[PDB]
Amino acid sequence: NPRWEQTHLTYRIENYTPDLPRADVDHAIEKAFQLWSNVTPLTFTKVSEGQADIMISFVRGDHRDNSPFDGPGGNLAHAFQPGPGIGGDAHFDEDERWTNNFREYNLHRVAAHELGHSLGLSHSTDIGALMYPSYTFSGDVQLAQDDIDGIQAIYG
Ligand SMILES: [Ca+2]
Ligand SMILES: [Ca+2]
Ligand SMILES: [Ca+2]
Ligand SMILES: [Zn+2]
Ligand SMILES: [Zn+2]
Known part of the structure; x- marks a missing residue:
């Protein structure tokens, strides 16, 4: 279980799905980092060039890591x-x-979960938690207490 050693993290969106307008991609990701920074001392800065701590991308089948889609x-x-490197990427x-609605799959809602991992969380057994292994969604995304507890046990 590794932790980030610095509380100020960088992220970049390498590419954009064509499923959604750009602005909506930006806001789904933004609001998802916000769920995590609201309840910890972590801060996130978006960059448009070079390497960031968290590199975000949309890819299909084999994309040169070892988990093809x-x-x-x-x-x-x-x-x-x-x-370091792919460490942190989503x-x-x-x-x-x-x-960007209640229909499968809500980007903001999946991002909330993946970024849980990007920050060091594993899965939760609580069905109401963003970290549950499996996608759930009814149209609102909030950390559950289980999520808050796990991210705070890591970052204070
Ligand atoms: Ca697509
Ligand atoms: Ca990285
Ligand atoms: Ca798939
Ligand atoms: Zn991958
Ligand atoms: Zn997961």
């Missing part, structure tokens, strides 16, 4: 645990239809 459904996205399967 699988077409629509199944695995939706994955993220790496804190650390990848979204472009074979999904990404949304």
